[PDB]
Amino acid sequence: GVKGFNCYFPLQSYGFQPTYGVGYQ
Numbered sequence: 001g002v003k004g005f006n007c008y009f010p011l012q013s014y015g016f017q018p019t020y021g022v023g024y025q
Contacts, residue, residue: 001007015021 010025014023014025
């Protein structure tokens with residue numbers, strides 16, 4: 001939780017399963 005919108009993690013912002021993990025980052 002860092003001051004500003006730049007603390008969110010990738011693993012927690014890109015799903016995990018092959019259903020969404022195969023999307024576009």
